[PDB]
Write a protein that binds this DNA or RNA. Structure first.
Ligand code: MG
Ligand code: MG
Ligand code: MG
Ligand code: MG
Lengths: 24, 98, 60, 117, 78, 155, 127
RNA sequence: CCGUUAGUUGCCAGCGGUUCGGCCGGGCACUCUAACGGGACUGCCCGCGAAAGCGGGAGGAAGGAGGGGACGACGUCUGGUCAGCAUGGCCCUUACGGCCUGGGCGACACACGUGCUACAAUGCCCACUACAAAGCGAUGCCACCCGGCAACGGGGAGCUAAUCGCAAAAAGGUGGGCCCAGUUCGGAUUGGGGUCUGCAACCCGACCCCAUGAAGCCGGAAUCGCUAGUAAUCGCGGAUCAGCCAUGCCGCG
């Protein structure tokens, strides 16, 4: 499942903001 | 001297106000460089027209924000009186910065 | 679950774990905006109305 | 000459003929010709006939590769079968392991379509 | 990917650490899953749900980084 | 495409040579929206026959062109209650456009590893009459003038 | 002491500045000869000179501002002629009839909803 | 397209200091910005068809609708939506109401829809060297310094926003390699190893490393969009949000 829970595949479907991305 | 911008979603309410401020000093004290039109900022919202399946047929809205700026070159102790005196403006917000 | 789910979206129970949104009038789940707090529906039926300042209909 | 003892990819460019070994690709070629100071921009059809073996006992010691690799591969799996975990079942049932969708695709764990209608 | 720090649910240690004041038994009936297979617990059997029932398994040394929720299959097709 | 007979686009002529014909071909080789990357091929090929012989790469270009522009050709058209094909002459503008697209598509077929090689050859090999762009040209006339007997439509 | 030209095509901005020099033509520094090294339309940016038989004559300061590369060139092919006419106005009938003194505006089409690249509608499936 | 208004972006286009940067003094034509306005009406002329109209042509930026947006009549489809909402009527009210843990819509012998990379020399890697238009963000955006062989971690400049930043744009140009190979083309699968957000990442996240490197040699019957900056190609943002379905959508070049 590209961009979901428990794999590693690819993120051009899940995004990234708030995901693990820098906040403050 | 003291700094003010002018922010309104409608230029008509903003330009007039921007033309309104100039009255409370430029005809009260030294000349003022006229309003400084910032590039207008938009909040571009397009929404699906339909309430269900028809995903296309969408329609678009904008919550434009017109920003303009006015700088006085000589803050005159009497003109500032004329400022706060103008307690009849419109539904527009403004800020005063130093 | 109409009048049963929005109430949940108030007490804030478990950790930052179930913190979602909720339209006001329409009370709808998703398609809600954090700007208006309105579903894509509960916004139009006020946008076209006019109770949405500066929210004209776009054109360009 | 007799290069990688096991397999032999002669008459090609070294660095890349390296890649065609169960366990070699690109950066493996980097540290190699940057630890054994042997210049990569060479062939094998005409080089110093001594630079053949200096890559052996370096490449052929610290880590594992070729037939000395699919063990670990074969290792970390038979257990998972005999362990009863759901992941172990994936490899068996012709299914994927990094959980994809099987309503479509997953041919790479299958290979053929079978229709049946 | 379990970064700087690993975990395991709370009442699990309630339901699994009392199993060692004397190196105790094996029977259990609980409700957690997402926990981490505990290297300090390769000597019991753990009740793990699937959807309608708890299906356990004898724990084995090799099981460490994997999760307790994998030994309890859910979608009965296989 | 029924009522008014449209407008032919008029093109930007070449810079190097003085003819629309040149640009009329470079844009044709252009792929993927890559324009400068095509004039290289052409002009790299130009800078070969300059070295090949005393043949100017333009004053020859046009001859294989007139060796690729055919004369009369067929056209599929429905009559009666089935499907046949009808021949006719060839529109001169179409005759030109037909030539170019004939020319370029002959490139990739030629066994040539680089680029402009695929260009000049089919050009040169058609400068005397032994090129692929000639074969597919005459074949139409071979498929056309063999149908002289269809003398009633014709128009 | 000089004449200015404006040149905007494909929303590009390239301020054009003609002077009566000899042979200096650069862009923001760099060098137009070698700023644009490797082009094809490169000669086409200076056309209103050999068409007026006056390339070996004047000089030009150049400022660009954003815009597309070809749009940066095609706009220069304007501000040249979009200058000079101030005190050099007889430069017309050997230009406008030939057809240079025009913007040739071709601004893009915006993307529209229910489509893709502005006009390519999605695949259509009656089935 | 242009005029004016106005100068915290921009400017040596003219000058004075420059660590030779628009950094400064300085100035508002130019750049750009956003308010009102002139402008294009077959207006004129050479002809054609009486007529509307047509081949023009000049001037003009554009000429015959200049090019896109939004605007969708009477009415059919007893069309779609009780699941955005309101609501008649029937029903459920010790539950057909409500809370939690876990599981499921991602399940797979299959098949279709819409897209994604390609199956390569106009080609593919590595290094170096410029141009955006729009959009967004203080309890947030993240420069920059160090650490990290990398996603990233500690410190922290600026910015409540034409200033600060996201932000490095790719195709482009130079230069070397690869000289047709199932390839230095493609990344599916999979072993091991990581950082990165939140009570918690197996089914059911990325990015990165050592690889493993599958079919893929241009595709039948058919069939799809597209008449101009459109088609193709290349890349840049937004919208819901503790995380979360964002290669789909809506915008920009
Ligand atoms: Mg114009
Ligand atoms: Mg109906
Ligand atoms: Mg790719
Ligand atoms: Mg990297």
């Amino acid at each position: 499942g590209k961009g979901d829970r428990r794999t590693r595949r690819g993120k051009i479907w899940r995004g990234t903001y708030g995901k693990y991305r820098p906040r403050k | 001297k003291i700094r003010i911008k002018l922010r309104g979603f409608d230029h008509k309410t903003l330009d007039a106000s921007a033309q309104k401020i100039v009255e409370a000093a430029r005809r009260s004290g030294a000349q003022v460089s006229g309003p400084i039109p910032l590039p207008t900022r938009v909040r571009r919202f397009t929404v699906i027209r339909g309430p269900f399946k028809h995903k296309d047929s969408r329609e678009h809205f904008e919550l434009r924000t017109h920003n303009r700026l006015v700088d006085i070159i000589n803050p005159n102790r009497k003109t500032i009186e004329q400022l706060m005196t103008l307690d009849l403006p419109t539904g527009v917000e403004i800020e005063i910065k130093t | 679950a109409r009048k049963a789910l929005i109430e949940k979206a108030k007490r804030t129970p478990k950790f930052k774990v179930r913190a979602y949104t909720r339209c006001v009038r329409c009370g709808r789940a998703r398609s809600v905006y954090r700007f208006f707090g309105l579903c894509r529906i509960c916004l139009r039926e006020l946008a076209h109305k006019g109770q949405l300042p500066g929210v004209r209909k776009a054109s360009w | 000459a007799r290069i990688a003892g096991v397999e032999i990819p002669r008459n090609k460019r070294v660095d890349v003929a390296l890649t065609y070994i169960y366990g070699i690709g690109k950066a493996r070629a980097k540290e190699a010709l940057e630890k054994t100071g042997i210049n990569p921009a060479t062939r094998v059809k005409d080089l110093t006939e001594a630079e053949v073996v200096r890559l052996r006992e370096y490449v052929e010691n610290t880590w594992k590769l070729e037939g000395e690799l699919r063990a670990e591969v074969a290792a970390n799996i038979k257990r998972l079968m005999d362990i009863g975990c759901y992941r172990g079942l994936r490899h068996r049932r012709g299914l994927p392991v990094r959980g994809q969708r099987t309503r479509t695709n997953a041919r790479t764990r299958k290979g053929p379509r079978k229709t049946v209608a | 990917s379990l970064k700087k720090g690993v975990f395991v649910d709370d009442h699990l240690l309630e339901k699994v650490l009392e199993l060692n004041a004397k190196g105790e038994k094996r029977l259990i009936k609980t409700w957690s899953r997402r926990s981490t297979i505990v290297p300090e617990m390769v000597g019991h059997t753990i009740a793990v749900y699937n959807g309608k029932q708890h299906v356990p398994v004898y724990i084995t040394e090799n099981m460490v980084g994997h999760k307790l929720g994998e030994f309890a299959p859910t979608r009965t097709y296989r | 495409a029924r009522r008014r007979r449209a407008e032919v686009r008029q093109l930007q002529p070449d810079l190097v040579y003085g003819d629309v014909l040149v640009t009329a071909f470079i844009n044709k080789i252009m792929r993927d929206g890559k324009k400068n990357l095509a004039a290289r091929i052409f002009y790299d090929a130009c800078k070969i026959i300059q070295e090949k012989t005393g043949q100017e790469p333009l004053k020859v270009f046009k001859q294989a062109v007139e060796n690729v522009k055919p004369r009369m050709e067929v056209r599929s058209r429905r009559v009666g209650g089935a499907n046949y094909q009808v021949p006719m002459e060839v529109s001169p503008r179409r005759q030109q456009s037909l030539a170019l697209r004939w020319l370029v598509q002959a490139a990739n077929q030629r066994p040539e590893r680089r680029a402009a090689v695929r260009i000049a050859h089919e050009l040169m090999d058609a400068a005397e009459g032994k090129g692929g762009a000639v074969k597919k040209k005459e074949d139409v006339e071979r498929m056309a003038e063999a149908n002289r007997a269809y003398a009633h439509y014709r128009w | 002491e000089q004449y200015y030209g404006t040149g905007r095509r494909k929303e590009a901005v390239a301020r054009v500045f003609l002077r009566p020099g000899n042979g200096k033509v650069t862009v923001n520094g760099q060098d137009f000869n070698e700023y644009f090294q490797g082009l094809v339309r490169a000669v086409a940016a200076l056309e209103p000179l050999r068409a007026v038989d006056a390339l070996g004559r004047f000089d030009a300061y150049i400022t660009v501002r954003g815009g597309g590369k070809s749009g940066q060139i095609d706009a220069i092919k304007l501000g040249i002629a979009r200058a000079l006419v101030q005190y050099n106005p007889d430069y017309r009938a050997k230009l406008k009839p030939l057809g240079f003194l025009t913007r040739d505006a071709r601004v893009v089409e915006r993307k529209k909803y229910g489509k893709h690249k502005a006009r390519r509608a999605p695949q259509y499936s009656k089935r």
